[PDB]
mmCIF file of all heavy atoms in Angstrom:
data_model
loop_
_atom_site.group_PDB
_atom_site.id
_atom_site.type_symbol
_atom_site.label_atom_id
_atom_site.label_comp_id
_atom_site.label_asym_id
_atom_site.label_seq_id
_atom_site.Cartn_x
_atom_site.Cartn_y
_atom_site.Cartn_z
ATOM 1 N N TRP A 1 15.711 3.896 32.098
ATOM 2 C CA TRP A 1 15.125 2.916 31.180
ATOM 3 C C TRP A 1 14.392 3.549 29.991
ATOM 4 O O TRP A 1 14.327 2.935 28.912
ATOM 5 C CB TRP A 1 14.150 2.015 31.936
ATOM 6 C CG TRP A 1 14.719 1.234 33.071
ATOM 7 C CD1 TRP A 1 16.045 0.992 33.349
ATOM 8 C CD2 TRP A 1 13.968 0.592 34.098
ATOM 9 N NE1 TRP A 1 16.151 0.226 34.489
ATOM 10 C CE2 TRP A 1 14.892 -0.038 34.973
ATOM 11 C CE3 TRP A 1 12.598 0.491 34.370
ATOM 12 C CZ2 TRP A 1 14.482 -0.767 36.092
ATOM 13 C CZ3 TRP A 1 12.189 -0.251 35.489
ATOM 14 C CH2 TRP A 1 13.137 -0.852 36.345
ATOM 15 N N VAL A 2 13.819 4.755 30.153
ATOM 16 C CA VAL A 2 13.124 5.373 29.032
ATOM 17 C C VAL A 2 14.093 5.757 27.913
ATOM 18 O O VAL A 2 13.693 5.822 26.742
ATOM 19 C CB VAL A 2 12.267 6.551 29.540
ATOM 20 C CG1 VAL A 2 13.144 7.735 29.854
ATOM 21 C CG2 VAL A 2 11.137 6.886 28.559
ATOM 22 N N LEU A 3 15.374 5.972 28.239
ATOM 23 C CA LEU A 3 16.411 6.244 27.242
ATOM 24 C C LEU A 3 17.084 4.957 26.770
ATOM 25 O O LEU A 3 17.349 4.788 25.565
ATOM 26 C CB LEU A 3 17.479 7.151 27.864
ATOM 27 C CG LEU A 3 16.941 8.453 28.432
ATOM 28 C CD1 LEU A 3 18.100 9.274 29.005
ATOM 29 C CD2 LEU A 3 16.129 9.234 27.385
ATOM 30 N N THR A 4 17.393 4.044 27.690
ATOM 31 C CA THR A 4 18.224 2.893 27.317
ATOM 32 C C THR A 4 17.427 1.802 26.627
ATOM 33 O O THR A 4 17.931 1.170 25.680
ATOM 34 C CB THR A 4 18.996 2.336 28.512
ATOM 35 O OG1 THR A 4 18.075 1.997 29.546
ATOM 36 C CG2 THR A 4 20.016 3.350 29.045
ATOM 37 N N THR A 5 16.210 1.507 27.109
ATOM 38 C CA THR A 5 15.493 0.358 26.549
ATOM 39 C C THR A 5 15.136 0.513 25.068
ATOM 40 O O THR A 5 15.253 -0.486 24.336
ATOM 41 C CB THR A 5 14.297 -0.058 27.428
ATOM 42 O OG1 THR A 5 13.358 1.020 27.487
ATOM 43 C CG2 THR A 5 14.766 -0.422 28.872
ATOM 44 N N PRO A 6 14.757 1.684 24.540
ATOM 45 C CA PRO A 6 14.557 1.736 23.079
ATOM 46 C C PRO A 6 15.832 1.463 22.313
ATOM 47 O O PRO A 6 15.798 0.763 21.285
ATOM 48 C CB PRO A 6 13.994 3.137 22.809
ATOM 49 C CG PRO A 6 14.391 3.968 24.015
ATOM 50 C CD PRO A 6 14.364 2.960 25.178
ATOM 51 N N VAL A 7 16.968 1.980 22.796
ATOM 52 C CA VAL A 7 18.243 1.677 22.137
ATOM 53 C C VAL A 7 18.492 0.172 22.130
ATOM 54 O O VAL A 7 18.893 -0.415 21.104
ATOM 55 C CB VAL A 7 19.389 2.476 22.785
ATOM 56 C CG1 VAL A 7 20.727 2.087 22.133
ATOM 57 C CG2 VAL A 7 19.114 4.009 22.679
ATOM 58 N N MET A 8 18.269 -0.483 23.270
ATOM 59 C CA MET A 8 18.504 -1.918 23.361
ATOM 60 C C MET A 8 17.594 -2.675 22.401
ATOM 61 O O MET A 8 17.984 -3.709 21.831
ATOM 62 C CB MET A 8 18.259 -2.361 24.800
ATOM 63 C CG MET A 8 19.283 -1.741 25.751
ATOM 64 S SD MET A 8 18.849 -2.010 27.468
ATOM 65 C CE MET A 8 19.205 -3.719 27.668
ATOM 66 N N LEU A 9 16.359 -2.192 22.232
ATOM 67 C CA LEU A 9 15.462 -2.858 21.295
ATOM 68 C C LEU A 9 15.966 -2.693 19.863
ATOM 69 O O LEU A 9 15.966 -3.659 19.085
ATOM 70 C CB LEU A 9 14.034 -2.344 21.477
ATOM 71 C CG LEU A 9 13.322 -2.852 22.754
ATOM 72 C CD1 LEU A 9 12.082 -1.976 23.015
ATOM 73 C CD2 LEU A 9 12.900 -4.326 22.616
ATOM 74 N N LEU A 10 16.417 -1.484 19.504
ATOM 75 C CA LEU A 10 17.019 -1.278 18.185
ATOM 76 C C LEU A 10 18.220 -2.197 17.966
ATOM 77 O O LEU A 10 18.355 -2.818 16.900
ATOM 78 C CB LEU A 10 17.392 0.198 18.032
ATOM 79 C CG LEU A 10 16.186 1.151 17.945
ATOM 80 C CD1 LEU A 10 16.699 2.593 17.872
ATOM 81 C CD2 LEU A 10 15.271 0.852 16.743
ATOM 82 N N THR A 11 19.109 -2.312 18.968
ATOM 83 C CA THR A 11 20.296 -3.149 18.768
ATOM 84 C C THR A 11 19.929 -4.614 18.655
ATOM 85 O O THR A 11 20.576 -5.354 17.907
ATOM 86 C CB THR A 11 21.360 -2.937 19.846
ATOM 87 O OG1 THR A 11 20.823 -3.245 21.128
ATOM 88 C CG2 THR A 11 21.844 -1.508 19.856
ATOM 89 N N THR A 12 18.871 -5.034 19.343
ATOM 90 C CA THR A 12 18.359 -6.395 19.189
ATOM 91 C C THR A 12 17.859 -6.640 17.762
ATOM 92 O O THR A 12 18.189 -7.666 17.141
ATOM 93 C CB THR A 12 17.254 -6.625 20.223
ATOM 94 O OG1 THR A 12 17.845 -6.529 21.537
ATOM 95 C CG2 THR A 12 16.680 -8.021 20.042
ATOM 96 N N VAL A 13 17.068 -5.712 17.227
ATOM 97 C CA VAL A 13 16.659 -5.792 15.816
ATOM 98 C C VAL A 13 17.874 -5.936 14.910
ATOM 99 O O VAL A 13 17.915 -6.793 14.015
ATOM 100 C CB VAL A 13 15.837 -4.551 15.438
ATOM 101 C CG1 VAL A 13 15.650 -4.505 13.922
ATOM 102 C CG2 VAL A 13 14.463 -4.606 16.164
ATOM 103 N N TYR A 14 18.884 -5.095 15.131
ATOM 104 C CA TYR A 14 20.064 -5.140 14.267
ATOM 105 C C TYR A 14 20.764 -6.485 14.366
ATOM 106 O O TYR A 14 21.217 -7.029 13.357
ATOM 107 C CB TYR A 14 21.055 -4.015 14.600
ATOM 108 C CG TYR A 14 20.479 -2.597 14.514
ATOM 109 C CD1 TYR A 14 21.019 -1.585 15.292
ATOM 110 C CD2 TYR A 14 19.348 -2.300 13.724
ATOM 111 C CE1 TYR A 14 20.477 -0.280 15.277
ATOM 112 C CE2 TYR A 14 18.814 -0.999 13.673
ATOM 113 C CZ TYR A 14 19.373 -0.002 14.469
ATOM 114 O OH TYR A 14 18.819 1.277 14.466
ATOM 115 N N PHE A 15 20.860 -7.045 15.574
ATOM 116 C CA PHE A 15 21.509 -8.358 15.690
ATOM 117 C C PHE A 15 20.703 -9.461 15.001
ATOM 118 O O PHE A 15 21.268 -10.339 14.335
ATOM 119 C CB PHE A 15 21.807 -8.694 17.143
ATOM 120 C CG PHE A 15 22.687 -9.890 17.246
ATOM 121 C CD1 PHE A 15 24.039 -9.794 16.900
ATOM 122 C CD2 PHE A 15 22.169 -11.125 17.573
ATOM 123 C CE1 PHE A 15 24.859 -10.921 16.929
ATOM 124 C CE2 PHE A 15 22.988 -12.264 17.621
ATOM 125 C CZ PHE A 15 24.346 -12.157 17.285
ATOM 126 N N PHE A 16 19.376 -9.440 15.146
ATOM 127 C CA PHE A 16 18.563 -10.423 14.448
ATOM 128 C C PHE A 16 18.751 -10.301 12.943
ATOM 129 O O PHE A 16 18.914 -11.308 12.244
ATOM 130 C CB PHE A 16 17.097 -10.267 14.845
ATOM 131 C CG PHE A 16 16.746 -10.952 16.137
ATOM 132 C CD1 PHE A 16 16.286 -10.236 17.216
ATOM 133 C CD2 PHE A 16 16.833 -12.335 16.241
ATOM 134 C CE1 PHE A 16 15.937 -10.875 18.401
ATOM 135 C CE2 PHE A 16 16.492 -12.965 17.437
ATOM 136 C CZ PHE A 16 16.077 -12.233 18.514
ATOM 137 N N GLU A 17 18.773 -9.071 12.435
ATOM 138 C CA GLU A 17 18.989 -8.863 11.007
ATOM 139 C C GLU A 17 20.363 -9.359 10.590
ATOM 140 O O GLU A 17 20.520 -9.990 9.537
ATOM 141 C CB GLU A 17 18.839 -7.376 10.686
ATOM 142 C CG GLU A 17 17.396 -6.915 10.725
ATOM 143 C CD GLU A 17 16.614 -7.357 9.491
ATOM 144 O OE1 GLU A 17 16.720 -6.681 8.456
ATOM 145 O OE2 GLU A 17 15.915 -8.390 9.553
ATOM 146 N N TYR A 18 21.374 -9.103 11.420
ATOM 147 C CA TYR A 18 22.704 -9.632 11.133
ATOM 148 C C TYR A 18 22.696 -11.160 11.066
ATOM 149 O O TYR A 18 23.233 -11.760 10.124
ATOM 150 C CB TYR A 18 23.664 -9.161 12.219
ATOM 151 C CG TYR A 18 25.002 -9.868 12.172
ATOM 152 C CD1 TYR A 18 25.932 -9.581 11.146
ATOM 153 C CD2 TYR A 18 25.361 -10.801 13.150
ATOM 154 C CE1 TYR A 18 27.183 -10.208 11.107
ATOM 155 C CE2 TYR A 18 26.610 -11.441 13.118
ATOM 156 C CZ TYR A 18 27.507 -11.143 12.088
ATOM 157 O OH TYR A 18 28.726 -11.776 12.057
ATOM 158 N N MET A 19 22.067 -11.813 12.058
ATOM 159 C CA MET A 19 22.045 -13.281 12.090
ATOM 160 C C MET A 19 21.276 -13.871 10.915
ATOM 161 O O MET A 19 21.622 -14.944 10.407
ATOM 162 C CB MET A 19 21.319 -13.745 13.359
ATOM 163 C CG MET A 19 22.165 -13.896 14.577
ATOM 164 S SD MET A 19 21.405 -15.092 15.741
ATOM 165 C CE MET A 19 19.903 -14.247 16.121
ATOM 166 N N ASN A 20 20.230 -13.187 10.457
ATOM 167 C CA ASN A 20 19.231 -13.799 9.596
ATOM 168 C C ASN A 20 19.300 -13.369 8.139
ATOM 169 O O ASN A 20 18.670 -14.017 7.292
ATOM 170 C CB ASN A 20 17.823 -13.555 10.166
ATOM 171 C CG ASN A 20 17.636 -14.241 11.504
ATOM 172 O OD1 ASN A 20 18.273 -15.275 11.777
ATOM 173 N ND2 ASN A 20 16.750 -13.701 12.331
ATOM 174 N N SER A 21 20.031 -12.305 7.818
ATOM 175 C CA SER A 21 20.130 -11.834 6.442
ATOM 176 C C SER A 21 21.248 -12.574 5.714
ATOM 177 O O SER A 21 22.359 -12.712 6.236
ATOM 178 C CB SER A 21 20.397 -10.328 6.402
ATOM 179 O OG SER A 21 19.375 -9.611 7.071
ATOM 180 N N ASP A 22 20.947 -13.049 4.504
ATOM 181 C CA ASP A 22 21.944 -13.768 3.714
ATOM 182 C C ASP A 22 23.054 -12.831 3.253
ATOM 183 O O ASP A 22 24.241 -13.170 3.330
ATOM 184 C CB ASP A 22 21.270 -14.437 2.515
ATOM 185 C CG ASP A 22 20.415 -13.472 1.720
ATOM 186 N N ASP A 23 22.689 -11.650 2.770
ATOM 187 C CA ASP A 23 23.680 -10.665 2.373
ATOM 188 C C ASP A 23 23.983 -9.729 3.541
ATOM 189 O O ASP A 23 23.200 -9.602 4.489
ATOM 190 C CB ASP A 23 23.180 -9.864 1.170
ATOM 191 N N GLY A 24 25.143 -9.081 3.465
ATOM 192 C CA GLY A 24 25.496 -8.113 4.488
ATOM 193 C C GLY A 24 24.449 -7.015 4.572
ATOM 194 O O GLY A 24 23.874 -6.597 3.564
ATOM 195 N N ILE A 25 24.186 -6.560 5.786
ATOM 196 C CA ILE A 25 23.202 -5.511 6.025
ATOM 197 C C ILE A 25 23.687 -4.631 7.169
ATOM 198 O O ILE A 25 24.267 -5.124 8.149
ATOM 199 C CB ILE A 25 21.803 -6.095 6.301
ATOM 200 C CG1 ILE A 25 20.757 -4.967 6.286
ATOM 201 C CG2 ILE A 25 21.796 -6.880 7.611
ATOM 202 C CD1 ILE A 25 19.326 -5.458 6.166
ATOM 203 N N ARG A 26 23.465 -3.320 7.025
ATOM 204 C CA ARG A 26 23.843 -2.315 8.011
ATOM 205 C C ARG A 26 22.631 -1.535 8.516
ATOM 206 O O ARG A 26 21.543 -1.545 7.921
ATOM 207 C CB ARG A 26 24.886 -1.347 7.439
ATOM 208 C CG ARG A 26 25.914 -2.020 6.552
ATOM 209 C CD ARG A 26 27.300 -1.854 7.112
ATOM 210 N NE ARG A 26 27.593 -0.473 7.485
ATOM 211 C CZ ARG A 26 28.471 0.305 6.863
ATOM 212 N NH1 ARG A 26 29.155 -0.124 5.815
ATOM 213 N NH2 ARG A 26 28.674 1.543 7.311
ATOM 214 N N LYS A 27 22.834 -0.859 9.652
ATOM 215 C CA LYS A 27 21.710 -0.255 10.360
ATOM 216 C C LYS A 27 20.999 0.804 9.521
ATOM 217 O O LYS A 27 19.784 0.957 9.644
ATOM 218 C CB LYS A 27 22.113 0.284 11.735
ATOM 219 C CG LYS A 27 22.667 1.668 11.736
ATOM 220 C CD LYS A 27 22.974 2.130 13.168
ATOM 221 C CE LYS A 27 23.557 3.529 13.117
ATOM 222 N NZ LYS A 27 23.557 4.149 14.477
ATOM 223 N N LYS A 28 21.710 1.506 8.645
ATOM 224 C CA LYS A 28 21.041 2.535 7.843
ATOM 225 C C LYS A 28 19.970 1.926 6.944
ATOM 226 O O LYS A 28 18.867 2.478 6.817
ATOM 227 C CB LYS A 28 22.052 3.307 7.004
ATOM 228 C CG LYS A 28 21.370 4.342 6.073
ATOM 229 C CD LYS A 28 22.369 5.233 5.329
ATOM 230 C CE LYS A 28 21.669 6.010 4.205
ATOM 231 N NZ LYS A 28 20.429 6.685 4.697
ATOM 232 N N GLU A 29 20.276 0.786 6.312
ATOM 233 C CA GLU A 29 19.300 0.100 5.469
ATOM 234 C C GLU A 29 18.084 -0.330 6.269
ATOM 235 O O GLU A 29 16.934 -0.168 5.821
ATOM 236 C CB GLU A 29 19.949 -1.122 4.799
ATOM 237 C CG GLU A 29 18.966 -1.960 4.006
ATOM 238 C CD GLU A 29 19.639 -3.062 3.205
ATOM 239 O OE1 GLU A 29 20.885 -3.068 3.136
ATOM 240 O OE2 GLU A 29 18.920 -3.928 2.660
ATOM 241 N N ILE A 30 18.312 -0.868 7.468
ATOM 242 C CA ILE A 30 17.220 -1.303 8.333
ATOM 243 C C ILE A 30 16.383 -0.111 8.771
ATOM 244 O O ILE A 30 15.150 -0.161 8.733
ATOM 245 C CB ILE A 30 17.786 -2.052 9.552
ATOM 246 C CG1 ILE A 30 18.483 -3.335 9.097
ATOM 247 C CG2 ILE A 30 16.668 -2.417 10.537
ATOM 248 C CD1 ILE A 30 19.485 -3.905 10.138
ATOM 249 N N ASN A 31 17.041 0.927 9.288
ATOM 250 C CA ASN A 31 16.327 2.108 9.778
ATOM 251 C C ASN A 31 15.507 2.752 8.661
ATOM 252 O O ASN A 31 14.339 3.118 8.862
ATOM 253 C CB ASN A 31 17.332 3.116 10.332
ATOM 254 C CG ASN A 31 17.929 2.677 11.663
ATOM 255 O OD1 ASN A 31 17.350 1.868 12.379
ATOM 256 N ND2 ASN A 31 19.086 3.257 12.003
ATOM 257 N N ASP A 32 16.110 2.912 7.478
ATOM 258 C CA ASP A 32 15.416 3.607 6.403
ATOM 259 C C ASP A 32 14.204 2.811 5.931
ATOM 260 O O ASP A 32 13.226 3.392 5.437
ATOM 261 C CB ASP A 32 16.340 3.807 5.213
ATOM 262 C CG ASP A 32 17.380 4.888 5.410
ATOM 263 O OD1 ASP A 32 17.342 5.654 6.394
ATOM 264 O OD2 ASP A 32 18.277 4.958 4.529
ATOM 265 N N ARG A 33 14.287 1.481 6.008
ATOM 266 C CA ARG A 33 13.204 0.630 5.532
ATOM 267 C C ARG A 33 12.118 0.481 6.589
ATOM 268 O O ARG A 33 10.923 0.469 6.249
ATOM 269 C CB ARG A 33 13.784 -0.745 5.186
ATOM 270 C CG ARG A 33 12.805 -1.783 4.604
ATOM 271 C CD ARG A 33 13.463 -3.160 4.526
ATOM 272 N NE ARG A 33 13.675 -3.689 5.872
ATOM 273 C CZ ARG A 33 14.585 -4.596 6.198
ATOM 274 N NH1 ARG A 33 15.424 -5.092 5.297
ATOM 275 N NH2 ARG A 33 14.669 -5.003 7.460
ATOM 276 N N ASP A 34 12.506 0.356 7.866
ATOM 277 C CA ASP A 34 11.602 -0.101 8.918
ATOM 278 C C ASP A 34 11.240 0.948 9.963
ATOM 279 O O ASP A 34 10.672 0.575 10.994
ATOM 280 C CB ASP A 34 12.165 -1.328 9.640
ATOM 281 C CG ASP A 34 12.264 -2.552 8.760
ATOM 282 O OD1 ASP A 34 11.730 -2.581 7.618
ATOM 283 O OD2 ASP A 34 12.890 -3.524 9.218
ATOM 284 N N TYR A 35 11.541 2.238 9.750
ATOM 285 C CA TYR A 35 11.379 3.211 10.831
ATOM 286 C C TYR A 35 9.962 3.223 11.415
ATOM 287 O O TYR A 35 9.797 3.397 12.633
ATOM 288 C CB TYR A 35 11.843 4.611 10.403
ATOM 289 C CG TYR A 35 11.087 5.196 9.235
ATOM 290 C CD1 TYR A 35 9.937 5.986 9.438
ATOM 291 C CD2 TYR A 35 11.517 4.983 7.926
ATOM 292 C CE1 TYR A 35 9.262 6.546 8.368
ATOM 293 C CE2 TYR A 35 10.830 5.539 6.838
ATOM 294 C CZ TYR A 35 9.681 6.311 7.077
ATOM 295 O OH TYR A 35 9.006 6.865 6.012
#
């Protein structure tokens, strides 16, 4: 869980951003902005 759960949290963020962003967005933009 110490390895998997942070990944799962990141992928959850990415899915929320996918659902909620009007324009297309990719993980690099999210990571670079929100690290």
Side-chain angles (χ1 to χ4, degrees), residues 1-21 24-35:
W1 301 344
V2 76
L3 304 181
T4 56
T5 62
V7 177
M8 295 170 73
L9 286 164
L10 292 177
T11 60
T12 296
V13 169
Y14 303 153
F15 191 73
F16 277 118
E17 287 284 278
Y18 169 72
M19 272 205 297
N20 295 332
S21 302
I25 190 164
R26 321 241 312 248
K27 86 177 179 166
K28 176 174 167 49
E29 175 173 351
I30 296 160
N31 287 338
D32 285 351
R33 182 189 69 204
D34 294 350
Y35 61 91

